[PDB]
């Protein structure tokens, strides 16, 4: 999971 | 005459019951059964069989610390041969030398939980109680008459009995599967559920009624979205299953994924969904980098009637137990009718973003969220594609009314108010309209950079950062930023250009609102004063000054003047002092108007500070  | 009964055994029929209640797994050594089925135990009785003439059996079952008759959480039947549906029952099915074959069956709306199941046998004048055992009663959505029936076993199957699946990540582009272990029937797991359900606040907060409210799915799934997380209590805070973990709490996709884990071993379908998200030198990125949004986001779908809500709410719905969140109904979100219980505006927020410019109104496509919302397919190793069930095709009339449902017409542009010099301070400010009868609370983000001729973009010359803006209905603002000359006189560009940019976030809705607006630092107007008479003749003498708009002084100050029909012979004269901040420097020269008619003196300025500076004064 990553920050867009 | 007739002696009481002596019970020698119990038998809990577990391969029967196992098989039939699709309990098997979780049978190997209790009671395990599902609600509004019937189920078996066989009696064997010490000496003579039961009589019906003679004896009269009693049943009684308890769950939980604080049962009651009214709670539903404790029930008394008698052994008999009418039975009525919908009750507590047993029954004689089978009457055998020593045996007796009795069948029971619970209500289909009955608390979830570990029962303790008593038996009295009474022989006229006298009677004799006594524990039979335990059984554990789980949700059945094999029943037409449970909440969580589904009307079709391949999806009982999928949804509730097996034991692996895959989780979706990645990105949009390229969707990964996370093959997983739900593992809901191994050893161990269906207690550790239990236990989960037996130490969540509502439980500490009123146990008797918690274990009441557990005949409810709405209920069940809403204490589990709660329980998976530690706020603390909860379970979480590489790994290919869920057990492990629930394993270890007993002594950002694994919280949906412990949430399936837990809810296909109380029995409600359910199924883990990925949504994915994706971006495309922007300010809302720049804000990015608690509501996040990320490359993907995983949550669960759980499958029950909703008689707690308007009818038309059965099916689908969303459990989200991301650091209690639901459940709301699926179709409730792709209709924006967010007032439906449980958390509709947050799961809304998940599948939907509305981005608008005004980059001077147009929209915005640089944030998309919301794409191949991803679940694993029923009983075959492939993605099922469910973006559909969340929201209407872009453009129709379905999205549109479904966006106004939500919504129940907010502007944003920048502004001035007054000139901008090369030197000076000033404010800029975001205004803010708010023509709606609706209150908002929203982030903003307002700053400003340099900015060159050719759009590429310096350091940061001002940032106003507020958590929480309100806006009351028909309403408007102006917040704002103060532009120091301190600030932008070191990282200027070969422009005297700055960029302001703003960004509005109404998180409920999940609203983002950008403007932006160029701003030119005009330089210092040189000034051209004409002395004399413009005459065909001879003989004119112009003069030309520069207030300083710095706050500091000017240093090698030079004007250089001409003009073919005016001088013969161009003339640079070099100022000899520094020029003061504010101070008014002035110079004079003398002409020879060559001939009749217009002409156009050319001025320049120059400085070690403030260079470039031009100015024009026609004559005649």
Known sequence: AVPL | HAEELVLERCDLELETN??????????????????????????????????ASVDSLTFSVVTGPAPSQEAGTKARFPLRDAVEEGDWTATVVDQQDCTLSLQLTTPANAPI???????????????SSFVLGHFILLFNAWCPADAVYLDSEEERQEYVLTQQGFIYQGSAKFIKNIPWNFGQFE???????????????????????????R???????????????????????????????????????????????????????????????????????????????????????????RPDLQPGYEGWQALDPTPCCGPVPVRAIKEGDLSTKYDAPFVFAEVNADVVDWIQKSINRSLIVGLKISTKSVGRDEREDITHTYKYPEGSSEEREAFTRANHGMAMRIRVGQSMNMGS?????????????????????????????????????????????????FSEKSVPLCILYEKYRDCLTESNLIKVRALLVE??????????????????????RILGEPKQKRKLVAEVSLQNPLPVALEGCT???????????????????????????????????????????????????????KGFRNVI
């Not at chain 2, 797991?189 to 008797?208: E, M, Q, R, T, W």
């Not at chain 2, 709660?226 to 805070?237: E, K, P, R, S, T």
């Not at chain 2, 999940?510 to 051209?528: G, H, Q, V």
């Open chain 2, 187 to 213: 050893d161990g797991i269906l207690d550790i559920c239990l236990i989960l359900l037996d130490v969540n606040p509502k439980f500490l907060k009123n146990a008797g009624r918690d274990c009441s409210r």
């Open chain 2, 113 to 127: 939980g570990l029962y303790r199941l008593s038996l009295e046998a009474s022989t006229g004048y006298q009677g």
């Open chain 2, 425 to 473: 301070d000033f404010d800029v400010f975001a205004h803010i309209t708010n023509n709606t009868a609706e209150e908002y609370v929203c982030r903003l983000l307002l700053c400003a950079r340099t900015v060159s001729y050719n759009g590429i973009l310096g350091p940061e010359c001002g940032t106003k950062y507020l958590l929480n803006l309100n806006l009351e209905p």
């Open chain 2, 215 to 305: 005949s409810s799915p709405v209920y069940v799934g809403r204490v589990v979205s709660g329980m998976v997380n530690c706020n603390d209590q909860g379970v979480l805070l590489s790994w290919i299953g869920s057990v492990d973990i629930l394993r270890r709490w007993k002594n950002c996709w694994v919280f949906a994924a412990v949430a399936c884990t837990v809810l296909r071993c109380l029995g409600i379908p359910t199924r883990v969904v990925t949504n994915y998200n994706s971006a495309h030198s922007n300010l809302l990125i720049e804000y990015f980098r608690s509501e996040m949004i990320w490359n993907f986001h995983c949550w669960v779908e759980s499958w029950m009637t």
């Open chain 2, 18 to 51: 196992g098989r039939d209640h699709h309990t098997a797994d979780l049978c190997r050594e209790k009671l395990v059964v599902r609600r509004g089925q019937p189920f078996w135990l066989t009696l064997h009785f010490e000496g003579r069989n039961y009589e």
């Open chain 2, 507 to 528: 998180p409920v809705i999940n609203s983002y609102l950008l403007a932006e607006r160029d701003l030119y630092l005009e330089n210092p107007e040189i000034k051209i």
């Open chain 2, 559 to 613: 004007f250089t003047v001409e003009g073919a029909g005016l001088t013969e012979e161009q003339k640079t004269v070099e100022i000899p002092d520094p020029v003061e901040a504010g101070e008014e420097v002035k110079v004079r020269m003398d002409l020879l108007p060559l001939h009749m008619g217009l002409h156009k003196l050319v001025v320049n300025f120059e400085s070690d500070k403030l260079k470039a500076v």
